């Protein structure tokens, strides 16, 4: 599928099990998604965008789909305003920009 | 044209008459460029995202070129770490994201 950028592009994820909803965002360097309670081992980070910095926990190795692919990696989750997915899945799922 | 997203999507653009490099943002509503002048009328806005707000500058119907491709609409110019060109410009250069 190819998604105009008409509206945001958002999309269903499964992660823990949870359905929810995210942004496709290839601004994003890393995944952040607001907090839940997530099995696993995580250690502390900031990441940062406009605004400044926020405190994270670091999730690695967590499975997670989006828009019915599979991906594995590192989740952030954290007091974000809107659950995101930036490069470091997007690119294990196959997408890029086009135009 | 087609962007892989490996490395952060960045692009030249040029807006009031300097080149400067930007990120290609789907997360993005809107786009936010450095302080920089620019020449015509503004009001001022503030805009959210990961670690809160920022004040910008909301210039309307400005002509900016990116990667090659011309448009015009409103640019926000204020305290980013970052360029962002985000979904009202991407819309005008024709990106779609593909996955
Ligand atoms: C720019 C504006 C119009 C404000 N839009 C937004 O910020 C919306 C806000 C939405 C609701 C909150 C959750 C984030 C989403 C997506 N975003 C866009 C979204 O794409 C946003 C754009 C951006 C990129 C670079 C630097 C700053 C801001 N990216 C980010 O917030 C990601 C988060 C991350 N760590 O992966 N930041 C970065 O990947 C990133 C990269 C380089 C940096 C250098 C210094 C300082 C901060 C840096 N942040
Ligand atoms: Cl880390
Ligand atoms: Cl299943
Ligand atoms: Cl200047
Ligand atoms: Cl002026
Ligand atoms: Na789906
Ligand atoms: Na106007
Ligand atoms: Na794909």
């Keep these: 599928p190819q998604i105009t950028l008409w509206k945001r592009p958002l999309v269903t994820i499964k992660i ?3 359905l929810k909803e995210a942004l496709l965002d290839t601004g994003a360097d ?4 607001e907090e839940m309670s997530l ?3 995580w250690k502390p980070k900031m990441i ?3 605004g400044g910095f926020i405190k ?3 999730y690695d190795q967590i499975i997670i789909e989006i828009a ?8 952030l989750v954290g007091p974000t305003p809107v659950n995101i997915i930036g490069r470091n899945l997007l690119t294990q799922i196959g ?3 086009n135009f």
């Design 56 to 58: 994270v926990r670091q």
């Design 95 to 97: 997408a890029t920009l």
């Design 48 to 50: 940062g965008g406009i």
């Design 16 to 18: 823990g099990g949870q």
């Design 30 to 33: 890393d995944t952040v998604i």
């Design 39 to 41: 099995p696993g081992r």
């Design 68 to 75: 019915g692919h599979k991906a594995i990696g590192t989740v």
